[PDB]
Design a binder for this molecule. Structure first.
Ligand SMILES: Cc1cc(C)c(CC(=O)N2CCC[C@H](C(N)=O)C2)c(=O)[nH]1
Ligand SMILES: [Zn+2]
Length: 139
């Protein structure tokens, strides 16, 4: 689990959105596994606006932050799960790192701010849904 809190927005994995998120919906995109809802309180996270390919992510299954190198946002095939059929997920970045089901929502960050959130995983792989192109999160 986990979210980005920037301005009056809450960014979560679409597959983990709650009823309150859907009832306060700003934007959602199943192809990216992202959903943004509105908040009453202002958040403290800032979004990175860069082309970094190195950063650090939070892994809840190890209670640890790990440095990673990650690929550029791309269209990647993701296997069928209990949340989506087998499909191509867009704006996804892959890295070598530990992940398990339940780690979705952990933040990936660089020196410029938040880059994205954990959205997929494999044997020694972790995938992140990029948010750097969502300029509207800044206003
Ligand atoms: C090792 C490991 C295995 C699995 C299965 C996962 C979870 C996962 O990738 N998905 C399930 C939740 C919807 C995700 C999506 N964006 O389509 C796809 C994980 O994080 N780590
Ligand atoms: Zn950066």
């Amino acid at each position: 689990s986990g979210a980005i809190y920037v301005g009056n927005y809450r960014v979560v994995n679409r597959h983990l959105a709650t009823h309150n998120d859907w009832a306060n919906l700003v934007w959602e995109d199943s192809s990216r596994d992202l959903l943004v809802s509105s908040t009453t309180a202002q958040g403290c996270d800032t979004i990175a606006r860069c082309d970094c390919q190195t950063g650090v992510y939070y892994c809840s299954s190890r209670r640890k932050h790990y440095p990673v190198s990650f690929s550029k946002p791309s269209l990647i095939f993701v296997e069928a799960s209990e949340y989506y059929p087998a499909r191509y997920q867009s704006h996804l970045m892959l890295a070598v790192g530990h992940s398990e089901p339940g780690d979705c929502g952990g933040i990936l960050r660089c020196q410029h701010g938040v880059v994205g959130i954990v959205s997929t995983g494999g044997n020694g792989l972790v995938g992140f849904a990029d948010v750097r192109d969502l300029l509207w999160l800044d206003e």
